[PDB]
Amino acid sequence: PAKIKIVAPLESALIPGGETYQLRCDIMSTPAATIHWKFNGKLIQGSNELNVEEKLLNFGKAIVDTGIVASILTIQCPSAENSGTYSCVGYNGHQTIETVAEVEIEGEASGCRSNHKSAPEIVFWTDSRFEMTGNVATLVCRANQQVDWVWMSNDELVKNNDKFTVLSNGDLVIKNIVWDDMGTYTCIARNQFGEARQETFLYPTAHH
Template identity: 35%
Template sequence: MLVSAAACFTLIFSIAIAEKTPVNQETMIGNRVLTRKPFLKFQTMPKGSVLLSGEPLHLDCVTTGAPNAVIFWKKNGKTIREPYLAKRKEVELNDQKLVSETSIIHSILHIQCPTSGTYQCISSNGYDLIEANATVSIIGDSDEICFPSLAPRITQFDMFRLELNGNAVTLRCESSDQKATWTWRRDSKTLVSGGNVEVNKNELHIRNINWESEADYECEATNEFGSAAERTFLMPVTSNNNILV
């Protein structure tokens, strides 16, 4: 079962309380100081399935961790989706700062014309590496010609993001159509660049977050064949003597 938006707060807050990092145990990530002990866990693992020939494959992989993690996919040991690039803008803006970088990331593998094999979801945050396998079996032969969907699909997004007040945050979505047009919304209102907000295609940069930044943010990918959207909940938090509270 996937993590509901309402459950995200409880999940992250309970982990934050349980895994605080004392002042004398700071973790350096580049020029940034992580205010908690690094961790990485699966919240949802991809499930194996038996499909009839011609049926599409849909696998979900959800991780919880800090610092920011990447997710990639393999089939039978061979990479079929590379990890997406690091959030460079956020890293630059938070240089030499205390950071939380705690998030829930949802990666989706959708294959219109799958073949049998072992599919792997692999995630790494530079401190931990975790992987989960799903065995997929295809039964029968289909005479139908397989055409991939031309409408965009969201393939990865931040379900939940927790970061310290005053820091910068990059929210990102990825789409199956690299040329899709992107729209970002906050509480259903379309966002444009201005003030502490910068809209850059599939990335939303928010500088100097504060309590007013707490909200649902929606990314939508659109092309001539359709659209797809997902939402992220951003939660600012405070730090006290380098301990996440």
């Protein structure tokens, strides 16, 4: 049965102006959930898109699809114009969950250069994914910039074949998973401004 649950909520906070500030939410969900962010009800990061392609690949199988996803929102130069209502919204196709926080900036941003030409940041990722042996699983990463994606397993590069597929949006598709696929997969986002890294985790569950 579909379930969605907050692991780490946003919390209301009074924050110093001009100092970079990062919000984070973690969400446990079956099936896999997507996270987007809102400021005073207006969308500012992420999407409603679900991974319907993987559902097709697993169509007619017994699906586990349980795990935790995480997302960060970075506030570069907090000013009075950034004080307001921030919400992290998780969504799995069946249920919607939302964590809301009042963030008020206390002070002025006399000197603060928000570098648009800063390193890319991985702002959403599959923290953990549980799936049954024999099914397709997907590890998700999303970035705040245009990047090229590279995935690493156990310090070896992941290359496209009939099992692994590195997609251009940031997904790593693993077909016909087996217990030896268990472990950490690092997603690397590279562009002209820098590279970001983020670990994901895959657990193939026993098939009874």
